[model samples]
Target chain A: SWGYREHNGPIHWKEFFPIADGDQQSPIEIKTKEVKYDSSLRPLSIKYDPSSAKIISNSGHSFNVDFDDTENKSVLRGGPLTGSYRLRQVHLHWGSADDHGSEHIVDGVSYAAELHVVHWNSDKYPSFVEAAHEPDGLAVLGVFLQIGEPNSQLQKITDTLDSIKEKGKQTRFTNFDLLSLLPPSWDYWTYPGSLTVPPLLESVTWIVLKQPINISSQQLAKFRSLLCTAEGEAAAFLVSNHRPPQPLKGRKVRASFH
Target chain B: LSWGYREHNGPIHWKEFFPIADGDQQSPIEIKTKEVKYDSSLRPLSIKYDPSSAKIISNSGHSFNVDFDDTENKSVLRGGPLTGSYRLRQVHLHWGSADDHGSEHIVDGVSYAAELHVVHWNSDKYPSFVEAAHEPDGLAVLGVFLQIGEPNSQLQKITDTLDSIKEKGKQTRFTNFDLLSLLPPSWDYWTYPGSLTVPPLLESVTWIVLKQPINISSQQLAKFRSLLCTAEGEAAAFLVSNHRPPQPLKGRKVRASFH
Candidate 1:
């Protein structure tokens, strides 16, 4: 099992997953000057079923909110994407401190944390497993998290942190208003990249929102409290879990708005 | 006594030697546009650079520096975020090993391919640059970001001279390079009080970073990395990554010249 332990972390992932050093990798540094404003890119159309969110579990990597992806009940479209992409799960990445934790760096700055909404190309592939292999299979919506005022909607997710403190611990959680969690501006930067974690597949079409949503320092500390090791194992806190931004190898990053 | 950019010698360990590294005012902060206020009172920048004032280009062990003839006020910058004239002393660059990320100051969290710094000293108050460096308002550095795009003709002069000064102690006679042609069209900038980005990190600089960025081809950027941090006789080490990460912006107000 691949965990985020420094010895088995991202730097060592390339030994097992060779594609970790692939040309098209995710969480790339977004240079605003290099980003082109494409009017052709359509407005984002997101339809997330609050009831579709079934359970919340501690994957040891981060707390994952698993969604029922049986049908197109929760789908994402538009904004540099063609057809419907089914929402599979939602996870997060953070740092030891409230100052730097984001995976994708804008300019040379890092946000306190980052939210990843994972989806698969249901139109092209049958399951998330099949879609994970192809080039144009996954679409990840990356939302940056800044430290400021508390977000009431995020309290729903943070409340369950105590329940799933240990790895592999899961509990029934539903009716999440995920839409209300987003910032008002849907303006984003889209580019072709890969997964930030190991098995570093080059399948995701990264759509990173420009506007950052707020999270208090106290809410951010809760994420760090989650364990990287499973129960019965020596206690080790998941202090930092963000993969640094990879190289942007001649890929064009298009913007939805100028 | 000196600092080199590496894992053991990077910005994280800079405080061990230079106590000012952990000071309140630091350089290369993340500029958030939403938080920046537009100061209508700031006057437009006035720049006068004599092409013949350029002396020589050399490898500074950190980055390649093009020294200027600051003996007289032939090349000087004034009028924006300054109380008096600041003489142009030198120009240098900061970059990463690859094209992905290689800038110092990040605007709204976005990093550019590289950044150029035009260092100046307060000639109005102090007699020399070294003397002025100790004062709070003694230095003003103009920062211009560089993105990977179409080749810039003006940068050709600088790139052509890279081979001559490939080692740390090496230098070459260089002159008549028009500095104004390197700047982008718009002069809209962000003004803030900060310190020198490198070691001995003095808190005497007034940063005026340009919003618009100039372009440079990927091949040209690779040439910059080819230069060595070591001297000619010693074992060669590529000056691959020579940029300092952003420091904490503690209650500092980053004012903008334009809305």
Candidate 2:
């Protein structure tokens, strides 16, 4: 029932979901001066099965590409994390303009957009829903999106925008090579936070990649055309759907590589 | 003739009318963190804002201005690279039509949805705000960047009164706004000597921009763009983009309150 509408958006979420104002919230501003290079943090190991992707849908807030999480077909390990976390879905946050849109800002610099790959701690919890409530359950990989050359891997996702223009609209999509979308370097910054969206449960372990991937201006413009409203509703464009960075709250951000 | 933000009369042509536009200390510069120096001597900012001090909100043709009752120093700002108390004169906002490129000052090349300026004038030595406009240490402006996210309850009062002042030169009485509560928790800031961003562009202000930003919904920001730059019985034009671009830093060192 929760949505990103003005009346029911993040500000009003606290009225219905009290934890929206909870500590350890996601999308904190990552300042380079405050980040510590931790030698103990290991390099990230991500294995995403191309065939695991099932369908992509318009969630009103963003376009979510759901993956079959029944088994460990795709998992993220290491990098300040303790166990294997299963990938559940992947989505994006962008703005009306190409200059700034990213949720997690680095040293006051904002990328055009950001891609979030959602995962859950399968080693500790039984299901994705159950793990979402625990403090050390969810893990989200954040990749910054800069405006530059076109990305071939992202082309598949952009191709489906026409099919899912309306909210809740979905189509069968499979064999998505999500790994190719990532930058070559896995160097990242790890911190403890929560989901950037509603319910805002303080349970996510955030891993933000240092290098940014590219998306053409025309490709980025296609994302804005997707409607935030569902079928037969008053048309409303999701021009900007990224949340600003929250306070760091004295949390330490560890870098995977110096 | 009054200065409007149209292409013909905007910032590009400001120097033709107000020569101060070409000054060395113009504000809203691009803040590169690598070049900023942390100053240990900069005192922590002390702000005292009275809810009752806000009197009215009006459309200034360029942006919305919230005038305050500066009769007494009840609402004042001091410390943090300031030598004396500055009385709160008014508050205004600058924004773009969309959410991407509205902010006046760019933080390491990143622009926000909007920017809030709480303008104040030196009251320690000046008789009034008008007289302090020409002095080097006469004014101080607190800049707060507004990024798109959840609705800010603190800004509800301001947004609720927008419809009443939809036309330029229109104004209505406003009060009971907790101005200080709108600021982010962290008082850490970047400071430098600069001139007023708008026309008359006096080189008299000390700029203090906050490091953290507050939130505003995309819908709430849309209401701001709906206001008219034209007044009654005039050709209509939306007050879309009111922000000035980043000015050259011109050898001035931006000092940070925290390392």
Candidate 3:
């Protein structure tokens, strides 16, 4: 049976991967000398009517916004090797602490938090998470966030962070399209790697965007309000929930623009 | 599993590792000026030795010794500041008061409230960053700065850990840790050449500074102020104001996308 045991925590999921480096990993800090180019990527020219947006709090580690998926079939933005990948699900990773949070690693470096806009190669994989383990299994758009000014888009959830701070809590939110939160710029860096979490799946083709989005400190407080308490006590929580870096295993990390 | 040890040198044989082979989404390039310019002569030297007792100090005025387990590090360059799989021996942060300020690598003289540096070394060139500091191709650093503003839910989560290390040199066993949780979702970065802000000023590092700055609360900044400092414990806490002034680009221009 699945149990919350030491060493078997989601952080130690690398054991499940066929070739996890028990040592040097990724999510390292982003260096400048190595990145040779910036990508001219863009959002797919598809229209989505976010007539209804529903937000679900998965006491596990995040609050998800269910978009009007029925109206918006996936769309592809052109790329080099293949046609563009299609949008799937978007989620976020946060720390209980304010200084650090995130999911993917560069070498061993971590950021305060990371956002993932999950997508898949329509020509190949059908399921998002399943395709996340094969080489080019899935495509994720990552964005870094630092506390600052509050974002108008995040006001709703941030205001409700304290309402449902535990597991099994789901909030019904409508009229929110995930795409609306995306940064205006499509500049990003792409690489081949695996999921930063359990099963340590390596099938991901990652597209980490360079520009960061701003959120007001009040908004962050809202997120902290949505806590996952320990037992009956308000567990001394820092939202720091994420998997550490995994071995790069000699993978080549490429830049998009020069 | 097309496993061949000899064929596995970073970038040389990555195809053998992943059948489809991982594609480099973005590679950082040098900034070329419209005017004619020559490269600088600040070259690095060879490593003298690996300082086994080196410590990682934070701007919050906290300092701690780090364990550098070389065996777990690949230390080969697959692009980005990391070459020769670099293992994270430790982590620390640097900061200012606002975004567009507070970092040595000034973008048109812009500073952010803080900068997070995850340092790694080219394991193949020398034993450690200490020894490789003298070499021109020994170290790789990923620098991500932080801007203070909206409370970042993620950053608030990390600050939640502040109570554990509130005092200087107060070490605790941190289990259930997931280092990856700290990176921004995007992998895009701005690559450049520069010397280590630490002593020795080695110029061999590949600096990949992501354009984005993650968020943290003012309270969180105050918390970080509790974690790092000099061994003597005098001066500003966590960071000890340990930031080298931005170096002159001389003729080196900063190149960004849409270029």
Candidate 4:
């Protein structure tokens, strides 16, 4: 019942999932005035095997590209992180309109959309689900989307969208170079934030890149066409699925690069 | 699901999905009267609105827009910083959670109880509203401030239909709306180049914001907020505040229609 609809939207989510109002919620507005440049923050370390990405499916809310997490074929290290975080899944958030669809906003500016590459603390936690309970259990790399030239890297995902137009639908999608999806610059802002979705778990150590990648308007419309309902159910467009930025609530944001 | 006046999906988050929300030409700017320049060249506004042109009132999930039929040029707006005739398209409103601050366009940091936007498109050069929305000289929007005062019977016709379109996407046949009658007695306005306040925040509109305000009762303003932002079968959430906060002027000029 909890969706991005007016009735089940982010504002009303607190009734069903109280943590939405919790401090350390994600997708927070990043202001330069508040952010402190921390030299102690290390450079990001990511290693991924293309075989890790197995399938892509529409989760009714948004599509998720699930990665095989049994072993650490794909992992993320360094950069405000103590232990290695294993690549778990990848997903996206966007709005009905192309300009205001991203999950995170930077100094009152929001990109067209946002990509969340999720990872779990594999070194300490027994599993991805188990790590989600702790404060420092998850690490997510957020990449912002802007409109400009068409992105060659995104064509792979857009091609598979038609197959999984309905919720609960899945298709084989692999050989993906997730790193290529990112912008040229990796300079980022780091903060302690929760999952920007329902159940709003404050477990993620967010690493949001400053630069945005490009995607055409045509590609954005395809993302909007995916159904929020399953086959045999009444149709409802997942026109928008990204959660808005939460409050700072006295939390300080640190920069990975000056 | 869509962008609404909520903490998460509100104006602050709009930039995440629409990059142009942060662009140079955005709307609902704070009208700094002292900073405004008096331009004597500005002509009086010409409005020829036919009540029969109004078609339906619907909940767009963001706010209620009273749509007008634009196939013919029966209703149009001319002059007042416009180079060509702009056909009347739709009329919508923006308000806030309280009486103190509901309007989109503010004057000297003061917000009115509510604001009404009468959207018009450049009918002379553009083929349709969609094609015109992207061009710089394609749209002209007339903005009127709504101050809390005595009850307005004209608003009664609109507020009464709030029951039918309480849910987003819900609509009812609404015609014979004499839009020109809703305007303030004085049509003196502040003109500037700006964009649509909402998403697909196109920087195409030429905004004409009136100095004089129309009076509206507090009770009737509440009825406007009664409309829900949700669709049918969705959880009910009122459209309490759909007005976007004042945007940066970005070195743009605000010209006065009257000195």
Candidate 5:
């Protein structure tokens, strides 16, 4: 079912599914000047337990963490609604090489990698995926990880690169807590959109967090070293997994703070 | 004759190999003494807990069971499979009733819904694989926890099969199931030697705990509850909150690897 034949590549993804509103996507450029001041949008509590953390490997193309379901809870404020969103999978979109990584584009800009903290609409939805196709289906907290500032957390993961540096390898850690990696503030910009990946499912409620987490230069190289390009082509390397920037398709972008 | 053993009833009796001594480095808790220095030399492991060779067998005491492919579950350490080839034996789990909690390994002091254990045996040590069960470095167990989340279709496939064995001691034959598809996408994990939290709690095993969890639907968990406590002959309820509390860290440090 997961064939990498012809038009199956990123360039032809849109052609397969017309409903995919890939044109109006997230990770858009943040105009600090354009951001309006909203005092109400602050998260109340950020709770996480490192003890329940577990990492699994599905071969190349993914590195996801399942937040502690019992203890991992986050409460937000200053939006149309306020409640706790349980943490699910935190995954990355990367390029084949160290220099280029990330899936979404903001005004045609791409960061090294994009971190999406997927949360379901606990208010109305039964589960995260259940709301995948609805406008209020899910809330993805997007945080940009750029190469700079010796990132301690990144080092912690990269150091383990040796054990599972190849595709399909996985080692477990009961101590990898995700909260420590989050930037200081919970203030975020809310918008409407779809998933950047295939199915390109629309109706997703996007919450592009303001802060960009630090990814040390060395850590960037680690990602580069472990990063894979598209599936085949021996020499293709880690530069292939990225999807090019999509058309903004006339969508409105809003931020919480001015 | 593979069977499930509890707190004081399991395989610890094979003392000839383990030589039951104090502070034995048994299972679920093998401490790591080496310092971690991040560099390029450390190439990541090939695959983490790949059930590619996993064979689904019906009456394994646990729920739907799969025998792991040992060659695929390997590691790089002085006494690991790197020194000898290990064959995967079986994979099972321990859990509690609550949806928000149940697993053994603590991540910064938190727990998840369930914990999965993939058991393997060292081939190079003793003549019979079971013979090595007594040695401190004779076995490796890959522990992965399952969290309740957005219904994973893959996981549902297994739970749906639970109806085949609704009552205790019920049995059936399942085939052609690609058990390996259940694994996560990242190989990054925390590695250390640990003791088997199960009875006989040997300290001679190596543990590779996955950093990511395998998500299962609420329905799948309900089926896990349907499994029997003993073999098909014993009709007792087998899996009613069978998890052990998190043990002491014992000043042991867990190491991580990225692939």
Candidate 6:
């Protein structure tokens, strides 16, 4: 019932879901001047098994590539995370235009899109569902996507978009290398926050990468056609699904690099 | 399995997931009676209620909510930290696992057994509760702390419906609720720009906390806990605890409607 519309949208979420207006919320404005450089923060580590990626689907929110989390074959550890955080899924937040769509803004700079590689604390929790309830339960890698050259690694994902145009639609999407989607540097700003969507539980240790990944303007437009509405419902595109930057509260934002 | 107050999901843990939990102007601050400023600028409280305005009493997963038919301003709250007419939206209760300190806000150093929130939206400025809930001046809530005493008949209807709508997401047709009668006789209160006193708060509400707390007896409070955190056809679990502790004042002022 809660959707991005005039009636039921982000700004109005506090009515039913009380915590939608909570402290340590997601997609915060990352001000550079206030960022604290922590020397003890370790560099990011990522490993992926092409076989781990199983399928992609329309979540009525964004395209999420569900990964096989039976094991830590595709995992991201270190970098503000203590345990092996298994890759659960990958999703993107895009805008209607090329200028702004990202959930987080870096010192007033907005991106055309943003990617979230959601990982969960496997050693401590049994599943992503259980882990999501714990504050230090999940670690998400945030990649800002700016308009530039078309990323070759993402083309494989774009090719399969047609089969899953509507919400709840899913198809086989495997044997893809998940490691090729990032920029060379893993330098990021880390903070404790919640998932951008509802249930918006405060469970994630957000690690937002500083470098922007490349995505051509045309390539980014392909996703705009994907329907947020389900079959038999009036059509609506996920032209802009990013939540606006929430207050930083008093949480400290730590930097991994100088 | 999901977000709850017990073992895993609680107030202290919500901060890691919810940035707004630590946000300035978040609700349920300790009302240091001595520190509060008495301001004559605030207007005397006013309430106009229609018993038929209430529609249903439902278990809202987190709390027991009595929804009102707010298509129009049949029931509205005015004055006392309010600029215009605000329509009555819904009613909810906040209690805790601990009998000593369960209520959201603390008066001086005293803690109540439970608390109630009669929610309203600035109907004069915004078209709907949803739109009004976004703006700082949009929402207004009358907070009444519930103390331990003899059972109050004013809540007998609600206590009767607890069994029928016991599970989360369960609902029963509940009407003729005198919304104004739920409060105590005293109109004297403390006013502040606070938020919904729970996880996922939006600092849009102008809180009007009554100085006089109503009574609900220990047995009545226990019946509220008997309400379920689980829905039907699932594992049964009681909603034993459900109240956010008082947060930092963050330099915000707490004004008194009475000197």
Per-prediction fnat values?
Answer: 0.00, 0.00, 0.00, 0.00, 0.00, 0.00
Candidate 1 iRMSD in angstroms? 20.5
Colliding pairs, model 1? A106-B109, A106-B110, A106-B111, A107-B109, A107-B110, A107-B111
* Stretches of candidate 1 exceeding 4 Å from the true structure: A1-258
Off by more than 4 A, model 2: A1-258
Residue runs of model 4 more than 4 Å from their true location after superposition? A1-258
lDDT of 1 by residue, B159-194 (tens): 998898899988898887667657775667999999
How far is A135's C-alpha from truth in model 2 (Å)? Answer: 22
lDDT by residue for model 1 (A87-114), tens = 9999999998888899998998899999
Residues B1-259, candidate 6, lDDT per residue (tens digit)? Answer: 3666777787778777777889999988998888988986765455656666899999987889999999876577776668878999899999887567689889888999999999999988898988888799999998899998899988898999999988899999998775665677555789989887665588899999989899988889999899998889999889999988889999998998766
Summarize candidate 3's per-residue lDDT along A136-200 as a digit string, tens digits.
66766788776887787778666655555665566776655444565544446666766555454
Alpha carbon lDDT of residue B97, candidate 3? 31
**What RMSD does each model have against the real structure?**
24.4, 22.0, 22.7, 26.2, 16.7, 23.6
lDDT of 2: 0.86
Residue-wise lDDT of candidate 5 within A105-126, one digit each (tens)? Answer: 5544567777877765566666
What TM-score does candidate 4 reach?
0.50
lDDT of 2 by residue, A1-258 (tens): 566567766667778877666678878788887789765665565667678899999999999999999987687776678888999999999987888889999888999999999999999999999999998999999999999999888888899999999999999999887766777556799999998888788889999999999999989989998999999999988888887677777889988655
Off by over 4 Å in 6: B1-259
Better of 5 and 6 by DockQ: 5
Q: What is the TM-score of each candidate against the true structure?
A: 0.50, 0.51, 0.44, 0.50, 0.43, 0.50
DockQ of each: 0.01, 0.01, 0.02, 0.01, 0.02, 0.01
Q: Backbone collision count in every prediction?
A: 6, 0, 145, 17, 83, 24
Off by over 4 Å in 3: A1-11, A15-29, A38-53, A68-76, A79-81, A104-111, A227-238, B1-259
